[PDB]
TrEMBL record, chain A:
Residues 1-20 are annotated as: Disordered. Residues 1-11 have a biased composition (Polar residues). It comes from Mycobacterium phage Patience. This is Capsid accessory protein. The lineage of its organism: Viruses, Duplodnaviria, Heunggongvirae, Uroviricota, Caudoviricetes. The gene is 4.
TrEMBL record, chain C:
The gene is 23. This is Capsid protein. It comes from Mycobacterium phage Patience. It comes from the Viruses. The lineage of its organism: Viruses, Duplodnaviria, Heunggongvirae, Uroviricota, Caudoviricetes.
Amino acid sequence: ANRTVSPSTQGVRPAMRQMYNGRNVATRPIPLIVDTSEIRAIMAAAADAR
Amino acid sequence: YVISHNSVVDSSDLEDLMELLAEHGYSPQAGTQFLLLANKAETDAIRQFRRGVVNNNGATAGYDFIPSPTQPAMMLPNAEGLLGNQPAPTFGGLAVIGSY
Amino acid sequence: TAPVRQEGIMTQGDLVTVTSDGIDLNALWNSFAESIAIYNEAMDNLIQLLTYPVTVPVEPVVQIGETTFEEATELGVPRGAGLPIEVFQMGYDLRHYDKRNAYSWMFLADADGRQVEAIHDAVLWADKRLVFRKVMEALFDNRTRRANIRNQAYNVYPLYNGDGVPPPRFKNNVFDETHSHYVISHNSVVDSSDLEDLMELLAEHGYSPQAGTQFLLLANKAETDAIRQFRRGVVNNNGATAGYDFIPSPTQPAMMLPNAEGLLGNQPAPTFGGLAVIGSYGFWNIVEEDYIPPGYLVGVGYGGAFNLGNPVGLRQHANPAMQGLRIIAGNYQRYPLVDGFYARSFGTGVRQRGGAAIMQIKASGAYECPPIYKKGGGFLV
């Protein structure tokens, strides 16, 4: 039989996944980045203005 | 209480109008729902906003106009979906034409 | 504009009362307790991840000589053996802080108890703002301190600074007395290079990804906004190519990135300790934190074969009656004045001087401690 080996035949399955690409859907969510410092400022200001 | 500085509406005017609420923190980040009330003369221009296409006064739209479920259909122009979210067909009791 | 600080004796005419108009202003103290509670949680999540309570006030480091074999002969005998040894020490400082409040009898005759509870709460906030400042200052202020314990003067150190005993030799890494973990980017904007260089400052002592050390990068939003844009093999700022992709964590918005149809390996977990992780770059877990000043990167290692702890040791006084914030009786106790004091004593030092590093993003010149955390600058953030 074929005795050929490589770091691939000795390896592990790559544990790969698909990541969201925005193709082949009707709409795409707006990419709204919100860091925690901005969440703190909103929540502090809301609680002050109440 | 403000003016557009142009005789016909831009996508930039919806951005400048959104800014007047967001400057106080009333914002998409804060989970604020937003409603725009407009006349036919304005909504019939706003229906034509498409991402990256130039509108009136050299404004370029940063989002797509997404029609509401009650509106007539459109063909999707690209393999990429429209940039936006499709609205519910009503806001309170009002009839929603779409989102921007 | 700045907040005000009223610091006199409380007289009549500093009283707050139900107005002529019938508003009970004394009900409206603690209007801002909830916004203070938000920033108090923010300070806590840093303190419990940057610090540990000191139970052993002094740390040793030891150096010893060696010996060698020789080839044997059949009639003759080999040379003998000995071992020289030396040792060095470091510790943590301890300092004292206090506040007074004072009232005239005319204030006390008419005052609402809600107004003195309001001042008491403002003091508790100021105590937290003090402890937090001194924890950050222990890490950011790169100057060596001295402390007296049991009539001996010890060194009290920050991270490696080009001062004190050098880092140990590790696997052909050898270090000068000038070796430092306070460094500059040499450029006005953050590179991918900078995160790669900052990691080598931990890795050069061991403390490495293959040793199992987990890592955290604390950064201001202004740096994270640039780091978010790093893509593997693409040029970013100052002509740096990125060695890695920025990988977002599960909390981030879905983004239509070019040349990115699949992810090899896991996303970084959404939180590290209590802090919210935005994503990762190489082995760094990246946290946005506005208590890090703009233009500073703070890289910290945890765990691994060397078992890195939290970077700053927090030292308290030996007597349990002197631990924590304390209320002490006044010198004025009768009439016409009453007074009283608040006090706390605590201090700080670094035990594992290589287990973190700080970079300041600037073109040229020495590292500056940021004025918000420099030791001379005050007692609040």
